[PDB]
Write a protein that binds this DNA or RNA. Structure first.
Ligand SMILES: [K+]
Ligand SMILES: [K+]
Ligand SMILES: [K+]
Ligand SMILES: [K+]
Ligand SMILES: [K+]
Ligand SMILES: [K+]
Ligand SMILES: [K+]
Ligand SMILES: [K+]
Ligand SMILES: [K+]
Ligand SMILES: [K+]
Ligand SMILES: [K+]
Ligand SMILES: [K+]
Ligand SMILES: [K+]
Ligand SMILES: [K+]
Ligand SMILES: [K+]
Ligand SMILES: [K+]
Ligand SMILES: [K+]
Ligand SMILES: [K+]
Ligand SMILES: [K+]
Ligand SMILES: [Mg+2]
Ligand SMILES: [Mg+2]
Ligand SMILES: [Mg+2]
Ligand SMILES: [Mg+2]
Ligand SMILES: [Mg+2]
Ligand SMILES: [Mg+2]
Ligand SMILES: [Mg+2]
Ligand SMILES: [Mg+2]
Ligand SMILES: [Mg+2]
Ligand SMILES: [Mg+2]
Ligand SMILES: [Mg+2]
Ligand SMILES: [Mg+2]
Ligand SMILES: [Mg+2]
Ligand SMILES: [Mg+2]
Ligand SMILES: [Mg+2]
Ligand SMILES: [Mg+2]
Ligand SMILES: [Mg+2]
Ligand SMILES: [Mg+2]
Ligand SMILES: [Mg+2]
Ligand SMILES: [Mg+2]
Ligand SMILES: [Mg+2]
Ligand SMILES: [Mg+2]
Ligand SMILES: [Mg+2]
Ligand SMILES: [Mg+2]
Ligand SMILES: [Mg+2]
Ligand SMILES: [Mg+2]
Ligand SMILES: [Mg+2]
Ligand SMILES: [Mg+2]
Ligand SMILES: [Mg+2]
Ligand SMILES: [Mg+2]
Ligand SMILES: [Mg+2]
Ligand SMILES: [Mg+2]
Ligand SMILES: [Mg+2]
Ligand SMILES: [Mg+2]
Ligand SMILES: [Mg+2]
Ligand SMILES: [Mg+2]
Ligand SMILES: [Mg+2]
Ligand SMILES: [Mg+2]
Ligand SMILES: [Mg+2]
Ligand SMILES: [Mg+2]
Ligand SMILES: [Mg+2]
Ligand SMILES: [Mg+2]
Ligand SMILES: [Mg+2]
Ligand SMILES: [Mg+2]
Ligand SMILES: [Mg+2]
Ligand SMILES: [Mg+2]
Ligand SMILES: [Mg+2]
Ligand SMILES: [Mg+2]
Ligand SMILES: [Mg+2]
Ligand SMILES: [Mg+2]
Ligand SMILES: [Mg+2]
Ligand SMILES: [Mg+2]
Ligand SMILES: [Mg+2]
Ligand SMILES: [Mg+2]
Ligand SMILES: [Mg+2]
Ligand SMILES: [Mg+2]
Ligand SMILES: [Mg+2]
Ligand SMILES: [Mg+2]
Ligand SMILES: [Mg+2]
Ligand SMILES: [Mg+2]
Ligand SMILES: [Mg+2]
Ligand SMILES: [Mg+2]
Ligand SMILES: [Mg+2]
Ligand SMILES: [Mg+2]
Ligand SMILES: [Mg+2]
Ligand SMILES: [Mg+2]
Ligand SMILES: [Mg+2]
Ligand SMILES: [Mg+2]
Ligand SMILES: [Mg+2]
Ligand SMILES: [Mg+2]
Ligand SMILES: [Mg+2]
Ligand SMILES: [Mg+2]
Ligand SMILES: [Mg+2]
Ligand SMILES: [Mg+2]
Ligand SMILES: [Mg+2]
Ligand SMILES: [Mg+2]
Ligand SMILES: [Mg+2]
Ligand SMILES: [Mg+2]
Ligand SMILES: [Mg+2]
Ligand SMILES: [Mg+2]
Ligand SMILES: [Mg+2]
Ligand SMILES: [Mg+2]
Ligand SMILES: [Mg+2]
Ligand SMILES: [Mg+2]
Ligand SMILES: [Mg+2]
Ligand SMILES: [Mg+2]
Lengths: 99, 246, 38, 150, 113
RNA sequence: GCUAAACCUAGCCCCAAACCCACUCCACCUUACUACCAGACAACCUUAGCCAAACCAUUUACCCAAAUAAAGUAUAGGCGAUAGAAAUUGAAACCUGGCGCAAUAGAUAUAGUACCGCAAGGGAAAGAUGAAAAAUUAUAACCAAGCAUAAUAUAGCAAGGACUAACCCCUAUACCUUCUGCAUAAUGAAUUAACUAGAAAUAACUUUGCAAGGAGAGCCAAAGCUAAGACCCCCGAAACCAGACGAGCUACCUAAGAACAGCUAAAAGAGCACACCCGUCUAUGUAGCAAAAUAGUGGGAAGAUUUAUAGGUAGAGGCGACAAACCUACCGAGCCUGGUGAUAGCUGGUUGUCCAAGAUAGAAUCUUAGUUCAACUUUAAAUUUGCCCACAGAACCCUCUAAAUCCCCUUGUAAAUUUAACUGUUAGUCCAAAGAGGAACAGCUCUUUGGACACUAGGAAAAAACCUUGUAGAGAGAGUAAAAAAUUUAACA
RNA sequence: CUGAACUCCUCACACCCAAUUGGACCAAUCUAUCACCCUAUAGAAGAACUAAUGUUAGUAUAAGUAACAUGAAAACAUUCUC
RNA sequence: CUCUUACUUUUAACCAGUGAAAUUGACCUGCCCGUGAAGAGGCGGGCAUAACACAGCAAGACGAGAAGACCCUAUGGAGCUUU
RNA sequence: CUCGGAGCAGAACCCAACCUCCGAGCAGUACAUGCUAAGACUUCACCAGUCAAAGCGAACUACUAUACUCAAUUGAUCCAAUAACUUGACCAACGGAACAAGUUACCCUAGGGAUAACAGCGCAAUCCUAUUCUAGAGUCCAUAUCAACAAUAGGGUUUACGACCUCGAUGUUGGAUCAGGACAUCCCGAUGGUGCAGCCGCUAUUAAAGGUUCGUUUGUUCAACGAUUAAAGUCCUACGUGAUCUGAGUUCAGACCGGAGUAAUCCAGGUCGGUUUCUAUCUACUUUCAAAUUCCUCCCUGUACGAAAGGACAAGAGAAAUAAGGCCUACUUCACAAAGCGCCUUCCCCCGUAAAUGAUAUCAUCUCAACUUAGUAUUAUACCCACACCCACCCAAGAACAGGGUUUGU
């Protein structure tokens, strides 16, 4: 019975581990975890947390680029929110549409 | 088996018990629905449809007298003397389409059933059989293997003597002189012309009737049938002959 | 259980507690405090 | 359970599929009975299926042995040396076909818990993370609170 | 200790009331309502039993209406009330009716003599 | 590596057939198994009760001479439970077999022996080589618990997820029974092996045969009838009755015996005090030396005393200086066997795998620890509406002019009713709401509408009843649901 | 942002309620006929045990614990102590 | 008894020999507060924490023992009394 | 204990409590309250009960005429009586056994924590405490002190209520032993107020380190009384604690008295007597190494105070008791030694308030203003601290083990 129910916890724990690892990597670049995950989605980057945690360990240069991209998108959000609509959309804020 | 109580332990009360409330089958008043049921006479119905059906298929022969033996031998009717059956009652169902000319001996007959057979030129008689006689006449061969002399047929009980002494019912103990009037009355009531059966080629057969003390045609009380040797033994003692002829 | 009218203030069902919290009076706030204007 | 059984890492036999694919199933040994209801489905598999199955797999040597037996069995042997015995007792012809095809597709490694659903010998292209990966360097490599040129 | 001084009071519900609501189809004899007192009064083609139960005298549809109430001049209690009413005031009560659905019969050709 | 494990015979069971039955010499009804003496005593006589009737009081099947059938009919009966014929009918019948057991089985049986009891009576356990033991350094090994080889390292229902890695990290309140609800500090269980618990009619259903007939006389039949398959546990009282066995213990009695130093008084149911009898108080002991003892201290000790021997009174009874004493260690009435597998609405137990549907208004009852009928629930079958609901419609009397309901086309949906056959559930908990009782107490009690629980998961700290959420598998994917507690204060003319 | 067995995603799907009820399979045994290193189709039945203060037997735990025993010397003759 | 003390014997403890009983679901068997079928070694939050004997103690394991004898229930018994 | 009406249950039906109210166990008039028969209702089953068109026969052309008024006004089967019709139970325990009461402590079995007594838990009427209000009492004066009618809270010690764990057992009073804890403080400490002169008191704030007696009757906890004390505190801990003890009480079997009953036997009654097991498996624990509290005496002093009577505080000194830790010189029990009745040693702190300076608020104001003193200890220091002679012997060391000595191993 324990072995059966452990299948749920394995998935849950696995994801808690990725979030901890992603949080650590993001903090090395001065970014909090919610800012990275949230802003990457706004760039239409659908990388999941499993891949992101692996990239942090084995592809640290790519991860810094992803952190930089998230940070750039985050700053564009602030500028847009500050503006009154006069400003055009940010270069990285433009969304690719699919019909 | 459930949990605890009487259901699981197997000790629930008898069927009909209701937990102490006066049960349904007791709180209803007694009434004589079934009083004397075992002494009530029963008659297996034989319809004219069934009789016509049996004749058409060759199972009963209308060229010879038809009695219980012939009906049973053709598997036309099943009689149970142990179940208080006293014979067959001829019922009217099928009268409209009944065409056969028959000489039939039954125990009871409806007025309309009598008319259906008489309109076609047939003869119908009502004949009483006591429980022993009825058993013998229905299954003769089992009786013959008992090695007993053929018994006499007992007379009807006093309550049945009026029925069998009345020409309206074609009673076997009724005055033959009264039949012509009774036969003509039905012909008038039901709008048919009474045929003159005396002119028929089968008139002798139509008249064949067993004596009121005779179980089988052609066989007298007190005869011993020897089936193994295909013989008949007749007693000659004067006292025995008086007993069997009285 | 307790009756609808009690001597003490009866505890509310949590959903009702939340209902009360969400429907509290919110006073109109002026853009500039009126004491800061002539 | 996982703790009550052995485990292994996902792997291949001689890097199979890298340069070319080599079927790992090397030999099949059937033991059918001329008489016996248990082998009815195995006898029908030898009449129409085994011959066409060998045409497709010329690298697998099939040995059909008809002998008295209560339990017909197929024994599969693989290039890595693994031997697997699977009973075909009272199986239908279609059931046996499926089993035999599965044996052909397997590598022969132990069917036990695989720790990871992937394997790689080169997990990092840009350099595996270490504690100094994202740390800046300082002039003359001076440590915190270290007097230079004293 | 002590004992309660209220005895009795354990009668079960009578299950009285309307059996056939507005618009329902009734056959002749069907009980429309049962009542302890006159709450609904018998209207057209509605009989009243000895126990005040209303039943259908005809097959049809049950209808409930409000009608002016004129008592029998021999009903002393009701006549005593109406005589004491202010002129211009008319009593009303609720009546139930059955609207007959089928005709009493039809003339059919039976012979050509 | 020990302890052990393993075996196939001994015999036994059920039938058939057949009627049955002893004997060397000597001893044996007196105290049986005792060579040898004067007596005369002589056998029969209704079973009862448990139990069923849900108490119990009339009553409650027990081979009685042919299987079958008549027939569960006539008839009997608190006409209740239940009991139950006859006339009549009428067949077969060749011992030497087995879908019986195989050492916890089958007879209790290796034996009615050992052992237990005064007696009647109760009553076991077990053996295993081979052709040869005149082959005995012979028949290899492998298998329960328990141990040994080989004690132990923070932390915890002892595992799971895992991991390079046993542990360290994270997750996780044994099982069974019983309950509204059990990690419960409620029940049972040291562990291993073996043994140990669902028996059948009435109908119906399914599948064959034949069919207005069916069936190898009986019986049934307005498509029936014949045949088959498939549903109804185990252990346990205190009791009651019958017939035996017991007064070598003890109560009392009968016959014929024995014991009682010394001192005082000399008369003694007199005093002191040994032997002897009894057992007042304390301590010890409490599976003890003892199923009533030991040590000391005590009562009596020529008497209504104590005591050896043989005998008598026997359970509806005896005996009793009445303590309901004592009658073979347990007497409000002995013990043994039998009726007897007594009965238990009461507790406990009830054995392979997998899937599916499935939670409950009430009435009556010597009934509320239980039952029967409804209700709910399950399976099969039939054919037709079921649920949700638009107007219109449903009371006056009276203080809350309440939330609502009933009826109901349309519409959205797929159920509903009927037929057939049954079982279990009928000891209920908290939450919201409308009330009643209590004290506008209760984790209180009583109804009503709804929800949840007694089934899963997440949350509220742990958490049956609050919130989120249901339909089941794998995944080292993803989006969410519910989901964190806020607040800080008194000068004055 | 985090956060379920809710929902989506790849593949699959009869596969999470007590009492009760319906259904699909099946261990071993015996018999009929097969089979012939352990089987098949059927017919049968003393047909399956983690629990009844269950019965019998073995061995544990308490536990090497509670408890139990022989006066002294000597030449084993004897003597001494009580 | 105030108010206990000393000594001897027994038991005791150690060595040698012999060797039981009740009991026992499994145990890798801490403390505090809180919680909960309402009194927790096992749940939540904290704290404590190498391993292993011997001798004591009796606060707890709702400790062992006897299917509570009190109380109620059962259309369960029995003794005795009686208008 | 059956039946009906009303409320609870407001509007279809239905709906409980040892809930709240009122009734029934008939009466009267008919004598077609004759017969028969569609369709319906129904007390949540069944049984029973209810309403009815048409028709037959009557009545009828004056009768709210046709199943009478009335709410319930009632009783199954068997059986009995009877020619028939029909009748028969306060069968009221009212779905009704044809007919049967007491008592048990001499008791038994099966069960129940489904259900009481002890304890826990829930609750807080009762009980206890605090605050709010300002009538009244206090010579005046509400608040030195006490306090009515009420109000708002807290406590969980009482008596009750509930029936949730336990009846295949959670041992029931008081005492002995050892006590852990709370502070709502009885004594000792520090303070504010006083109707505080002083000595005594009353009241409140703070303080739980330390302490809180011995006797007579009673089983007693209590209570009364005697003699003391600085004081003889209140409570919780399964009304702490029976695998530590006690068994006087309560509460089995015997017996007596009063009383009840025909008796058996019984009563909150009194009275005499009456068996208290356990060899420790687990948890916990077995030298908190070591700072002390209090009374009295002298002195201050017959001083401060006071009309007088009376009569202190602080410092200073001495001597005791208790507690903790040791010791044997003497005494005593005793005698290579262990002991008390003997002797020796014993050290810091308590935070309630009382005062300056001085702002918000240019005075003042001890200040949840910045700040200054009474006013504070890292509680102090003390103790402990080495180690392969170790076979054996001795020992003031010790259950074993360990420890000390052997330069005291013929
Ligand atoms: K009848
Ligand atoms: K035996
Ligand atoms: K159990
Ligand atoms: K508990
Ligand atoms: K419990
Ligand atoms: K218990
Ligand atoms: K004797
Ligand atoms: K002894
Ligand atoms: K039980
Ligand atoms: K019962
Ligand atoms: K939640
Ligand atoms: K001494
Ligand atoms: K203990
Ligand atoms: K009754
Ligand atoms: K209360
Ligand atoms: K108990
Ligand atoms: K006393
Ligand atoms: K323990
Ligand atoms: K100020
Ligand atoms: Mg059970
Ligand atoms: Mg029950
Ligand atoms: Mg409420
Ligand atoms: Mg009412
Ligand atoms: Mg009612
Ligand atoms: Mg009986
Ligand atoms: Mg009885
Ligand atoms: Mg006969
Ligand atoms: Mg045997
Ligand atoms: Mg083993
Ligand atoms: Mg852990
Ligand atoms: Mg089980
Ligand atoms: Mg309970
Ligand atoms: Mg739980
Ligand atoms: Mg338990
Ligand atoms: Mg129990
Ligand atoms: Mg059966
Ligand atoms: Mg009797
Ligand atoms: Mg007797
Ligand atoms: Mg004697
Ligand atoms: Mg004598
Ligand atoms: Mg003398
Ligand atoms: Mg004397
Ligand atoms: Mg004397
Ligand atoms: Mg005495
Ligand atoms: Mg003697
Ligand atoms: Mg005597
Ligand atoms: Mg007496
Ligand atoms: Mg007595
Ligand atoms: Mg005896
Ligand atoms: Mg017996
Ligand atoms: Mg039984
Ligand atoms: Mg299901
Ligand atoms: Mg009754
Ligand atoms: Mg009931
Ligand atoms: Mg509806
Ligand atoms: Mg509708
Ligand atoms: Mg019910
Ligand atoms: Mg409740
Ligand atoms: Mg997630
Ligand atoms: Mg889902
Ligand atoms: Mg699925
Ligand atoms: Mg198989
Ligand atoms: Mg088979
Ligand atoms: Mg079995
Ligand atoms: Mg077993
Ligand atoms: Mg067992
Ligand atoms: Mg021990
Ligand atoms: Mg010992
Ligand atoms: Mg000794
Ligand atoms: Mg000892
Ligand atoms: Mg020893
Ligand atoms: Mg136990
Ligand atoms: Mg606790
Ligand atoms: Mg120990
Ligand atoms: Mg001890
Ligand atoms: Mg425990
Ligand atoms: Mg115990
Ligand atoms: Mg019990
Ligand atoms: Mg009896
Ligand atoms: Mg009804
Ligand atoms: Mg009419
Ligand atoms: Mg009744
Ligand atoms: Mg009734
Ligand atoms: Mg009676
Ligand atoms: Mg007494
Ligand atoms: Mg008992
Ligand atoms: Mg309870
Ligand atoms: Mg209590
Ligand atoms: Mg308790
Ligand atoms: Mg309170
Ligand atoms: Mg005043
Ligand atoms: Mg308390
Ligand atoms: Mg309750
Ligand atoms: Mg117990
Ligand atoms: Mg103390
Ligand atoms: Mg205080
Ligand atoms: Mg106590
Ligand atoms: Mg004791
Ligand atoms: Mg104790
Ligand atoms: Mg006493
Ligand atoms: Mg007296
Ligand atoms: Mg006494
Ligand atoms: Mg002084
Ligand atoms: Mg100043
Ligand atoms: Mg100033």
């Amino acid at each position: 019975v324990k072995c059966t129910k452990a299948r749920y916890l394995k998935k849950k724990n696995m994801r808690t581990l990725w979030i901890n690892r992603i949080t650590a990597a993001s903090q090395e670049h001065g970014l909090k975890y919610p800012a990275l995950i949230g802003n990457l989605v706004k760039c239409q980057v659908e990388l999941n947390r499993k891949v992101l945690a692996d990239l942090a360990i084995y592809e640290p240069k790519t991860f810094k680029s992803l952190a930089a991209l998230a940070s750039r998108r985050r700053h564009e959000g602030f500028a847009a929110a500050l503006g009154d609509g006069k400003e055009p959309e940010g270069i990285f804020s433009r969304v690719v549409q699919y019909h | 088996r459930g949990h605890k109580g009487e259901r699981q332990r197997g000790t629930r009360p008898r069927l009909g018990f209701e937990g102490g409330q006066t049960p349904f089958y007791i709180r209803i008043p007694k009434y004589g629905f079934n009083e004397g049921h075992s002494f009530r006479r029963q008659y297996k119905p034989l319809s004219l449809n069934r009789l016509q059906y049996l004749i058409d298929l060759g199972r009963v022969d209308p060229s010879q007298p038809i009695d219980l033996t012939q009906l049973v031998n053709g598997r036309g009717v099943t009689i149970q003397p142990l179940k208080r059956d006293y014979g067959v009652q001829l019922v009217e169902e099928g009268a409209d389409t009944f065409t056969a000319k028959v000489n039939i001996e039954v125990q009871l007959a409806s007025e309309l059933a009598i008319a259906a057979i008489e309109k076609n030129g047939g003869v119908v008689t009502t004949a009483f059989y006591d429980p022993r006689s009825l058993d013998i006449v229905c299954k003769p061969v089992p009786f013959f293997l008992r090695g007993q002399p053929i018994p006499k047929r007992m007379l009807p009980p006093e309550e049945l003597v009026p029925y069998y002494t009345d020409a309206k019912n074609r009673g076997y103990l009724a005055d033959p002189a009264k039949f012509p009037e009774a036969r003509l009355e039905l012909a008038r009531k039901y709008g048919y012309i009474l045929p003159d059966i005396t002119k028929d080629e089968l008139f002798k057969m139509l008249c064949t009737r067993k004596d009121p003390r005779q179980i089988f045609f052609g066989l007298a009380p007190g005869w011993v049938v020897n089936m193994a040797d295909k013989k008949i033994l007749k007693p000659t003692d004067e006292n025995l002959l008086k007993y069997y002829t009285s | 259980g307790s009756k609808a009218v009690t001597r003490h203030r009866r505890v509310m069902h949590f959903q009702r507690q939340k209902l009360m919290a969400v429907t509290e009076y919110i006073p109109p706030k002026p853009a500039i405090h009126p004491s800061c204007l002539p | 359970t996982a703790r009550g059984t052995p485990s292994r890492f996902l792997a291949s036999v001689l890097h199979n599929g890298l340069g070319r694919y080599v079927q790992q199933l090397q030999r099949l040994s059937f033991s059918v009975s001329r008489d016996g209801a248990s082998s009815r489905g195995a006898r029908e598999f030898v009449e129409r299926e085994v011959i066409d199955f060998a045409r497709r797999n010329p690298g697998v040597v099939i040995y059909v042995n008809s002998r008295p037996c209560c339990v017909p069995r197929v024994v599969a042997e693989y290039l890595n040396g693994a031997v697997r015995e699977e009973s075909i007792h009272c199986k239908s012809v279609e059931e046996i076909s499926t089993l035999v095809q599965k044996l052909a597709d397997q590598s022969g490694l132990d069917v036990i818990r695989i720790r990871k659903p992937f394997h790689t010998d080169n997990p990092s292209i840009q350099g595996q993370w270490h504690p100094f990966t994202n740390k800046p360097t300082t002039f003359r490599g001076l440590r915190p609170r270290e007097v230079q040129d004293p | 200790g002590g004992s309660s001084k209220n005895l009795g009071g354990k009668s079960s519900g009578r299950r009285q009331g309307i059996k056939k609501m507005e618009g329902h189809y009734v056959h002749a004899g069907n009980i429309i309502a049962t009542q302890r007192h006159f709450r609904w009064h018998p209207g057209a083609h509605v009989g009243v039993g000895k126990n005040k139960c209303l039943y259908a005298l005809e097959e049809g549809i049950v209808r409930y209406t409000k009608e002016v109430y004129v008592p029998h001049p021999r009903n002393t209690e009701a006549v005593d009330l109406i005589t004491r009413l202010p002129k211009g005031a008319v009593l009303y009560k609720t009546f139930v009716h059955v609207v007959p659905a089928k005709p009493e019969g039809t003339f059919k050709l039976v012979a050509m003599l």
